[PDB]
From a paper:
At the end of the tail is a large hexameric assembly of the muzzle protein gp44. This domain is formed by insertions into loops between IG2 strands E–F (residues 453–904) and G–H (residues 940–1012), with the E–F insertion making up the bulk of this region. As this domain adopts a fold with no significant structural similarity to known protein domains, we refer to it here as the ‘crass fold’. The muzzle is gated by a loop within blade 4 of the propeller. One role of the muzzle is likely to be the formation of this constriction, preventing leakage of DNA and proteins contained in the capsid and tail until infection is initiated.
Here, we present the characterization of ΦcrAss001 using cryo-electron microscopy (cryo-EM), enabling de novo structure building and elucidation of functions for around 1,440 protein subunits constituting the virion, leading to the identification of a novel ‘crass fold’ in the distal part of the tail.
Author numbering:
A (entry chain C), D (entry chain D), E (entry chain C), F (entry chain D): 1 to 238
B (entry chain A): 2 to 147
C (entry chain A): 1275 to 1371
G (entry chain A): 1275 to 1323
H (entry chain A): 2 to 49
Write the structure that this text describes.
């Protein structure tokens, strides 16, 4: 459903009025609510415990089609430009794409061969670095976060005596805003996520209806103004 | 928030304590009308309509400038009678036509007038020619003009 | 300050201009805002669903000073040149006691 | 989202949908509430028991991307400038960075080799110092906090007959304030954390909507709620 | 957050007014409430069962950073000046620092070697003094409280045939008051804990927000005046 | 806190925040309530079942520092002045100190050696005196209370063929009253525990806030509550 | 005794001085206080909001 | 505490029993004016 249909169905279900004599719900307001609704839907349908079915990304075909048009595969770029300091001795710092939302699969191609990357926790790092060998298994590599500046930088801790030739990242792309009209026309300099023009939704038509329903619920709870509703529907903000 | 209070406007009231003022009255208001005039705006605050100048066109058509300060007027049936001081002490007759006042000068001289003693008049209609205007100052003799 | 009102110009409705200033003061406070309406950005005056609503000003001495007292004088009025008829029906005052 | 976007969406969520039907909020107050919100979200999403999912820092990809832009790796500096008194005989005092929020991994490079540091409790210290050897294991080092003056000083208790050449600390950086406008323009002298100018959020866009919603709930509780609302919503402040 | 920010954010969240025409909340009152709030936060985050997470001093990094800027290490001074009477025959009385809040680690360096001190209960003393040897284990020393005069005195019951050369005490320093303004200006001789001037908070910025929220809750419950709220929030006074 | 600080913070907690919106309280009444509060806190924090944590005297460091400034070690004096009648044949009557609140450790030094005293119950006495030997174990001594006249007299039942040379008592001293002003100035003749002048709290500053809060609750119950409030709050008087 | 009141001095508000004595009495009692206001210390008269 | 009672000042009354006095009246007053003179102080006690 293109953005015009989004706004029209928002009108059908929320009873706001299109006339400017009685200011109803502005297109900026509906754009903001739809952006928040799609972000919430992504965060709830990704984590299995955020929805009512207990199913996350790859637990059913419907979730797969929901997240299909956000899955992106890109390469990591070496951070040798900045001579920063790492936490490990054998850590090659790599910069990730800017339009990153969630990482789901990482791989590194070394001279020995491709090795899937394991996101290791701060406790597992201390646990496995208190042992004799202090290296990963033959078919895996470690990854921890490091000093980042308006980006995301990762320390790729691969076993010594090896060199990193590539770093692929399969990730969920950051969803773009849902904007129904050029906001610069009536509204001076208002933006959603740095965008002022029409931004048609970049997601599958499967969850367009869920986004619309969530936006309508958020609009009703916002106009109600009750604190209880605000907290109850902020519970689903993650 | 927690609570609300509706306020109605039935007039304007003063002289009462702020702690014991009443919501149906206003404490002060400039250029408002709470009565239905030119529309059905009764009990609803509305603007006060503005004025419109009327020219004092003589029967010949030339403009008529009034000498100076006014002391009093008199509307007999449709003829307004102005008693004005100034350089001289003049008298006028204004008749309201469709868009202009047919202004005539009934006298211009030294009728002893003073701004401290304004005019108070009575006017009668006895026939089409005897339309009198009696007027009195607190200083000078009482006078008449047809 | 919730309040209904309508402004007209020779039979033609004007839903953009109702008032132009709001003085609110008491024994120890005095604040004022211009009651402007910006569609996208927050503004002192904003309308939705044919009911205007305005924020009571904050005292000029301290801009963080809300109007808080047992009673307060509230003054609506146009003080910019214009020639419109402004029917001003009612005015509700939301407060926290 | 930009700080202007933060304010406008905050007035679209709070203040009903920009109806001016709730207590008017200033820019300083909005900045304060957004700062409080970001601290609250950080503290709740680090501790697994503070959130609704039961997941902490590195228990899911979402938390990793949430805390990504706060992870900082820095070196500790020897505190030999002040001849203070230590609690242990073999303790080399080190000063931690000033912009420290939470420590998650610490390591020390000695002449023998790198040794992951274990934060030992006040009871575990007494338990392990009542034994014959009274030294750590071959591949670990101990750390306890000591006299600090407007900073954080740590006692590095490494095994005897060894020297410390480096002390690296991977820590969560203190978040910067969220300020929507130059506070010195309208307000005389007011600050959030010692800052008076505009301050963009130094976090990933993932938790920006969560921060906005938490700020909305805080505003609603403070400006439209009673004592019960404040007490109930202060539970999620830790 | 310096004390000015403390008061300003107290104003933002509690809606008290800064003007002296309408007396709102005095700076002395906010100082008192903040002092009580920080004391309560210390007592609740120290004891694991006082908070909602079940975590005390050294059960998480956040608690460690919370209590970092209070941990102090100091030496005990012999009480040979006063020839008082002890409860044990081999008890050397020692005076502790005046700015003592809570003890967490104690050690004594004798001619035999360093020995961690065990705080023994009044029942354990009778239990272990009803046995043949009546001495501690080879690697520990006992400690019990004795007659104290505006201080804290401890009987150091170390095994006989040994001499005490040092007595180190790692303890949580007594927090200083939080005062926003020189109280002597408007208020004649009011004090918080013997202090009348500005006393910037000596704790980490981590728990500044918790202190502020607790102070706001206490202020609301005090102005409410309800007995039920007073008892409910006095439950958290320990 | 000083007594003036006690009164001022009491009027900041009770009396709303110094709004004069609750029953006015005099200085004598405040002193009485503070004294009652300190006795209540002592009795509740000694008995583990009286508090909310389930911890008594020496079950945590906080309780130790709470009771630190009340622990007193004193010698018992032989009661040979009065030829009273004892219940046991080998009982040497001893008089305890007058400023005694609670006994926690008692010992006797005999010619054979020091022997920790066991407070035996009225039933355990009958049980152990119905046996062949009818004497304590080699390393303990018995104690039972007997006829006392405005004091405390104790029957020291030590094993026969032995003599008593010393009787040490480590006890909790009776707390002194908390008086804010010289009561003889305004009031004719009123005392708290036989004291009319200003009396600073003879306790550690740890429990001063707890005493203040308990006094506030007692004042609220007495001066703003009904019979139910008094009955409910009298439960915590023991 | 809760009560609203305001004192002025040539248009200028005075929020410090309202009354100076309070006699309350009955068939068998008679008391009086001076109604002073001390900002920090407790006093018979205190204003807030 | 438990209860409250608002009192208004509409004038001054005497000759009535204390047990049956009315809250809207004052029992005695010196140099007061309950009428709006020089200001809008009607029904509000003000100085003379």
């Amino acid at each position: 459903m293109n953005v015009n249909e989004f706004s029209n169905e928002f009108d059908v279900l929320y009873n706001n009025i299109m006339s400017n004599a009685a200011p109803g719900l502005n297109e900026y307001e509906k754009s903001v609510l739809l952006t928040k609704a799609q972000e919430e839907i992504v965060k709830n349908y990704f984590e299995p415990a955020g929805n009512k079915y207990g199913k996350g990304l790859d637990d059913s075909p419907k979730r797969q089609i929901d997240f299909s048009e956000l899955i992106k595969v890109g390469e990591g770029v070496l951070n040798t430009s900045a001579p920063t300091i790492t936490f490990d001795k054998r850590a090659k710092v790599y910069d990730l794409p800017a339009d990153l939302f969630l990482v789901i699969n990482e791989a590194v191609d070394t001279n020995a061969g491709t090795k899937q990357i394991v996101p290791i926790s701060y406790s597992d790092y201390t646990r496995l670095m208190s042992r004799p060998y202090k290296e990963p298994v033959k078919y895996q590599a470690w990854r921890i976060i490091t000093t980042s500046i308006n980006n995301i930088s990762v320390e790729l801790i691969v076993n010594s005596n090896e060199t990193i030739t590539d770093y692929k990242v399969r990730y969920i792309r950051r969803p773009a805003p849902i904007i129904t009209t050029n906001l610069s026309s009536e509204y001076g300099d208002v933006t959603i996520n740095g965008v002022s023009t029409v931004s048609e939704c970049e997601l599958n038509p499967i969850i367009h209806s869920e986004i619309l329903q969530r936006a309508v619920e958020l609009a009703k709870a916002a106009y109600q103004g009750d604190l209880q509703a605000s907290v109850e529907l902020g519970q689903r903000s993650e | 928030a927690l609570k609300k209070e509706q306020h109605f406007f039935k007039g304007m009231q003063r002289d009462l304590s702020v702690s014991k003022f009443n919501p149906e009255y206003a404490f002060d208001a400039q250029n408002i009308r709470i009565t239905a005039r030119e529309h059905d705006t009764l009990l609803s605050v509305s603007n006060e309509k503005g004025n419109k100048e009327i020219p004092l066109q003589s029967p010949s058509g030339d403009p008529v400038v009034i000498d100076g300060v006014l002391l009093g007027q008199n509307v007999l049936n449709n003829y307004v009678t102005l008693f004005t001081k100034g350089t001289n002490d003049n008298i006028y007759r204004l008749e309201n036509k469709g868009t202009y006042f047919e202004t005539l000068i009934l006298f211009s001289g030294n009728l002893n007038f003073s701004t401290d003693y304004p005019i108070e008049s009575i006017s009668v209609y006895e026939n089409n020619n005897i339309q009198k205007v009696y007027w009195v100052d607190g200083l000078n003799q009482a006078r008449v003009i047809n | 300050v919730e309040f209904r009102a309508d402004s007209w110009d020779s039979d033609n409705l004007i839903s953009n201009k109702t008032f132009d200033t709001l003085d609110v003061w008491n024994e120890y406070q005095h604040g004022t805002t211009p009651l402007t309406n910006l569609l996208g950005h927050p503004s002192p005056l904003k309308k939705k669903f044919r009911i205007w609503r305005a924020n009571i000003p904050r005292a000029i001495a301290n801009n963080r000073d809300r109007i808080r007292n047992t009673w307060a004088y509230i003054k609506l009025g146009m003080n910019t040149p214009n020639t419109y008829r402004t029917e001003f029906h009612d005015a509700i005052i939301h407060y926290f006691a």
